[PDB]
Structure 1
Amino acid sequence: AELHRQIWQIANDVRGSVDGWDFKQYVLGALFYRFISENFSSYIEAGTDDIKDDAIKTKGYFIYPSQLFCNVAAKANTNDRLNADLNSIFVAIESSAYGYPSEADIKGLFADFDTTSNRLGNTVKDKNARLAAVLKGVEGLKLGIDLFGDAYEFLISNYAAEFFTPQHVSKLIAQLAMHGQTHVNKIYDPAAGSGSLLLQAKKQFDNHIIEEGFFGQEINHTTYNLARMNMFLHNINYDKFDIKLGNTLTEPHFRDEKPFDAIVSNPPYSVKWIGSDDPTLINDERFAPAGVLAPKSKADFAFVLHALNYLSAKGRAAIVCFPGIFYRGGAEQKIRQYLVDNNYVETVISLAPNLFFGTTIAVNILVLSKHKTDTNVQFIDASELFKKETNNNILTDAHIEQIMQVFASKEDVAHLAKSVAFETVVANDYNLSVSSYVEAKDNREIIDIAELNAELKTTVSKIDQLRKDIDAIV
């Protein structure tokens, strides 16, 4: 916010001039093209640096960033060269510009991506003036060590007004994916949405931990596109780093690569699907160990079963849910039964409402492990976090630090949750989680101290009524 918040407001000024999604596609494509052009120029000229470049023609040298970054921008079709000939008829060469990095067939393409900026548009001069105004406004963004994509995070958060995460909660669940395990890999994600929650660890651990790039899967088409450009902005290696499109309930991939070592997710809620079910998806590799499916109104735990399928021998897992999936009838009860069949479900931690964007409900996080001791431990958490006005809170680094301290070695802290037993949870009907908050503020008093006070009230009261009777002289 030091030199930032002004530029956040500049992006808010650039937000014109129609409904947000339509021009927003062109805005994201513009900043995307600008960042790829600047990164490519930074690679090719870190040392003689040239604003304008040449037709040097050496293909053999050209193919080496086409193996390294996988894409030549072009000889002269960079942004900074194109920024000289702005307002020049015509503008549709940008379509042909998208032909250039989309060659990329060698090797492991990750292309076939940039089909966002279509043409509507009603005349060609409308297209020229509008796209040139967008390029001019995006050129004036004084950004240039080179933190760029947080304004992109702002602009992608400025919609559904989808619901992704308030980003300190993502930092929290990242710290749940902790700790001390330099062990390939991280991180798979079912229903990733944005790459926001898929960012914090390796961005914090750029050379601290060294495992592999990121894998995942996401439902929507345009959300898939913004997710790939989101993960592409943050200066992340080309190595295997991707997400494939599809649904985990319909196209669960990749089984063969691999049993994963850490996962986080934000599954959407009440996501009713085909019932119950017409194919043999009872008899797959992951729902047959449960015993029953996840039907329409209770379509949540299919994601957590798909999550616990793709897990290592040691590496923990962390997902989010809302505490309304509590017992939810006998189907979800026996789902919970197979969950508590072992110490699969390790810990659960509640989180106070809202701490989201107008949802307005509370949530909870489930941390799972095939790394046992074993007893169940329902370390749920109420207040305090502020919630509503600006973000809010957001959020109390000492509070999450001390809840990690609680999560470290199994304390039993009253005015807060504590450990329970397996005998306790079979004494429950596998409830999530009534136990074990205690405090109620039912505070005692004193008989005599109350009653002589009440006698003082009377000694005031009767003489004041007498004085009112004096004042009844009319």
Structure 2
Amino acid sequence: ELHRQIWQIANDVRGSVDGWDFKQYVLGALFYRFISENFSSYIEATDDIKDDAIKTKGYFIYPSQLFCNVAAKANTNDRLNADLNSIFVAIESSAYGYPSEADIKGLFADFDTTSNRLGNTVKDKNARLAAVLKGVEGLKLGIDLFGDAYEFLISNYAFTPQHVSKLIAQLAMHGQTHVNKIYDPAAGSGSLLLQAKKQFDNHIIEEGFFGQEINHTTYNLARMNMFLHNINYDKFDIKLGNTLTEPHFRDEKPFDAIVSNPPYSVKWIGSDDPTLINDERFAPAGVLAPKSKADFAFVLHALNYLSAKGRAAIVCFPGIFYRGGAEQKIRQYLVDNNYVETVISLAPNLFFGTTIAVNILVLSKHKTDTNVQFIDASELFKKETNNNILTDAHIEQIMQVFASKEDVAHLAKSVAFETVVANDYNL
């Protein structure tokens, strides 16, 4: 049963410090278990399970070109934890450096560095991470429902809940059997990117789930997040870096679906110190975003990386409404072409560590032209604590009115372009 093992995770890992310290150790041990079980189920798919150090260098190179992590002969979790409760600690500190041998090709690595030795004394460290690995062994996971426990444990109290992420995915995905997908500026976790392959193993793989993220400790958990979900490897990457100051990839390519979740109004002192007034993406706006409201810089970066076929689906705090002429001219440039298609209101709170509501912009280089400012305040099942959950066949009404431009009362409708240029460009 699902919630049985979920409750096993929620109890059997919490000892005995702050969660944002043993977070790394528990998730690293679980990730080591997944590497072990995946590589064992690869090499045993004929029943020579108990292995030996005779490994075949010509065959040893082939998963290093294919899965990129040939573990060892005998450094798996199945062997290390039966032979556990023994000196010493740093067998796995070597046996993380060895599966990161992997110099060819497409490393996506240098990765297990979060697990460390502290601890106060070394036998205490031995006993504690021995208990960690043994508690990872004590889980009834078998064989394919692995990453559900990871998605549960990353959801701690202290993160972009799964139904809102499903809504963002379903908005950017209809009538589009095309390529490439999918880009993400400031991904955070790999949560909101993941609802593509939750559905889109169906037709064919398209390209890699691209992404760029700022915080390195979140970058590690994001790169393992879409690793655990049986996703293939070669293009399925995230690159570390800030998307505004260090943008990549400019070269590759105009996309056909993008999603994001930018943080609320992070500061950036850029305007106008480099040539971002005459760059490739901020110059058609006529101005840069102001000195602490980064959000329309994210939406201009969003409309940069989009082809003549796809569509953008991003979120905003609802406050980016008029906010002076520096924001009015960005909204003016958005509505001046047929860039923006719809906006969607959602109910407060609907988030961890937040009070205010959100809005959702859906942009397209695709014309009718009218701006269906399709709102919702309820429902939006915001009753059960905290705002758990916009269920299934509940966002289907939201997608359903979104289908062909309908006009339904007690709910929103289309407007005229002349009416929205008559008003001062609101949301």
TM beyond 0.5 = yes
Q: Aligned with 1:349: secondary structure?
A: strand
C-alpha displacement of 1:282: 1.6
C-alpha displacement of 1:358: 4.3
Residues 365-396 of structure 1 show CA distances to partners (whole Å, capped at 9, x for unaligned) of 00000011112221111112233644533123
C-alpha displacement of 1:13: 3.0
Q: 1:462 maps to which residue?
A: none
Residues 332-387 of structure 1 show CA distances to partners (whole Å, capped at 9, x for unaligned) of 00011101111100111111111212412111100000011112221111112233
Asked if residue 12 in structure 1 is aligned to residue 7 in structure 2, the reply is no
Instruction: Find the aligned partners of 2:179 and 2:195 in 1 and give their Cα distance.
Output: 17
Instruction: Find the aligned partners of 1:190 and 1:3 in 2 and give their Cα distance.
Output: 32
Residues 49-84 of structure 1 show CA distances to partners (whole Å, capped at 9, x for unaligned) of 344211123110111111110111100111101112
C-alpha displacement of 1:428: 0.8
Residues 111-155 of structure 1 show CA distances to partners (whole Å, capped at 9, x for unaligned) of 111111112122211111111111111110111251111221121
Q: Aligned with 1:313: secondary structure?
A: strand
Instruction: Find the aligned partners of 1:41 and 1:75 in 2 and give their Cα distance.
Output: 10
Q: Aligned with 2:269: secondary structure?
A: coil
Larger deviation: 390-399 or 131-140? 390-399
Conservation of the 8 A alpha-carbon contact between 1:316 and 1:370: yes
Instruction: Find the aligned partners of 2:60 and 2:353 in 1 and give their Cα distance.
Output: 50
Residues 439-460 of structure 1 show CA distances to partners (whole Å, capped at 9, x for unaligned) of xxxxxxxxxxxxxxxxxxxxxx
Instruction: Find the aligned partners of 1:254 and 1:275 in 2 and give their Cα distance.
Output: 20
Q: Aligned with 2:22: secondary structure?
A: helix
Q: 1:67 to 1:313 in 2, by over 3 A?
A: same
Q: TM-score, normalized by length of structure 1? A: 0.87
Conservation of the 8 A alpha-carbon contact between 1:182 and 1:209: no
Q: 1:347 to 1:42 in 2, by over 3 A?
A: same
Structure 2 counterpart of 1:172, from 149, 167, 173: 167
Q: 1:253 to 1:244 in 2, by over 3 A?
A: same
Q: 1:391 to 1:204 in 2, by over 3 A?
A: farther
Asked if residue 426 in structure 1 is aligned to residue 424 in structure 2, the reply is no
C-alpha displacement of 1:307: 0.4
Larger deviation: 257-266 or 357-366? 357-366
Instruction: Find the aligned partners of 2:281 and 2:222 in 1 and give their Cα distance.
Output: 27
Asked if residue 142 in structure 1 is aligned to residue 137 in structure 2, the reply is no
Instruction: Find the aligned partners of 1:3 and 1:105 in 2 and give their Cα distance.
Output: 38
Conservation of the 8 A alpha-carbon contact between 1:37 and 1:78: yes
Instruction: Find the aligned partners of 2:246 and 2:162 in 1 and give their Cα distance.
Output: 29
Larger radius of gyration: 1
Residues 78-117 of structure 1 show CA distances to partners (whole Å, capped at 9, x for unaligned) of 1101112111101211111012211111111111111111
Instruction: Find the aligned partners of 1:62 and 1:197 in 2 and give their Cα distance.
Output: 35
Larger deviation: 184-193 or 271-280? 271-280
Instruction: Find the aligned partners of 2:70 and 2:124 in 1 and give their Cα distance.
Output: 30
Conservation of the 8 A alpha-carbon contact between 1:354 and 1:388: no
Structure 2 counterpart of 1:49, from 12, 25, 47: 47
Q: 1:400 to 1:3 in 2, by over 3 A?
A: closer
Conservation of the 8 A alpha-carbon contact between 2:30 and 2:136: yes
Instruction: Find the aligned partners of 1:205 and 1:297 in 2 and give their Cα distance.
Output: 37
Instruction: Find the aligned partners of 2:386 and 2:47 in 1 and give their Cα distance.
Output: 42
Q: 1:65 maps to which residue?
A: 63
Larger deviation: 186-195 or 388-397? 388-397
Larger deviation: 114-123 or 308-317? 114-123
Q: Aligned with 1:197: secondary structure?
A: coil
Instruction: Find the aligned partners of 2:254 and 2:5 in 1 and give their Cα distance.
Output: 45
Structure 2 counterpart of 1:303, from 294, 298, 304: 298
Equivalent residues, number = 426
> Where does 1:91-110 land on structure 2 (aligned, <5 Å)?
91-110=89-108
Q: 1:245 to 1:91 in 2, by over 3 A?
A: same
Conservation of the 8 A alpha-carbon contact between 1:191 and 1:265: yes
Q: Aligned with 1:283: secondary structure?
A: coil
C-alpha displacement of 1:225: 0.4
Q: 1:130 to 1:324 in 2, by over 3 A?
A: same
Q: Which runs of 4+ in 1 moved over 6 A?
A: none
Instruction: Find the aligned partners of 1:257 and 1:172 in 2 and give their Cα distance.
Output: 27
Instruction: Find the aligned partners of 1:117 and 1:132 in 2 and give their Cα distance.
Output: 13
Conservation of the 8 A alpha-carbon contact between 1:343 and 1:376: no
Q: 1:37 to 1:245 in 2, by over 3 A?
A: same
Q: TM-score, normalized by length of structure 2? A: 0.96
C-alpha displacement of 1:244: 0.3
Conservation of the 8 A alpha-carbon contact between 1:267 and 1:303: yes
Conservation of the 8 A alpha-carbon contact between 1:165 and 1:197: yes
| Structure 1 runs not aligned, ≥5 long | 432-473
> Where does 1:171-250 land on structure 2 (aligned, <5 Å)?
171-250=166-245
Q: 1:3 to 1:405 in 2, by over 3 A?
A: closer
Instruction: Find the aligned partners of 2:317 and 2:206 in 1 and give their Cα distance.
Output: 31
Conservation of the 8 A alpha-carbon contact between 1:349 and 1:365: yes
C-alpha displacement of 1:12: 2.8
C-alpha displacement of 1:237: 0.5
C-alpha displacement of 1:3: 4.0
Instruction: Find the aligned partners of 2:336 and 2:9 in 1 and give their Cα distance.
Output: 54
Higher-RCO chain (CA-CA 8 Å, sequence separation at least 6): 2
Q: 2:115 maps to which residue?
A: 117
Q: 1:3 to 1:203 in 2, by over 3 A?
A: closer
Q: 1:22 to 1:84 in 2, by over 3 A?
A: same
Larger deviation: 184-193 or 111-120? 111-120
| Structure 2 runs not aligned, ≥5 long | none
Conservation of the 8 A alpha-carbon contact between 1:318 and 1:367: yes
Instruction: Find the aligned partners of 2:105 and 2:281 in 1 and give their Cα distance.
Output: 33
Instruction: Find the aligned partners of 1:3 and 1:304 in 2 and give their Cα distance.
Output: 38
Conservation of the 8 A alpha-carbon contact between 2:184 and 2:211: yes
Instruction: Find the aligned partners of 1:366 and 1:147 in 2 and give their Cα distance.
Output: 33
Q: 1:130 maps to which residue?
A: 128
Instruction: Find the aligned partners of 1:396 and 1:147 in 2 and give their Cα distance.
Output: 21
Residues 408-453 of structure 1 show CA distances to partners (whole Å, capped at 9, x for unaligned) of 111111111010011011111001xxxxxxxxxxxxxxxxxxxxxx
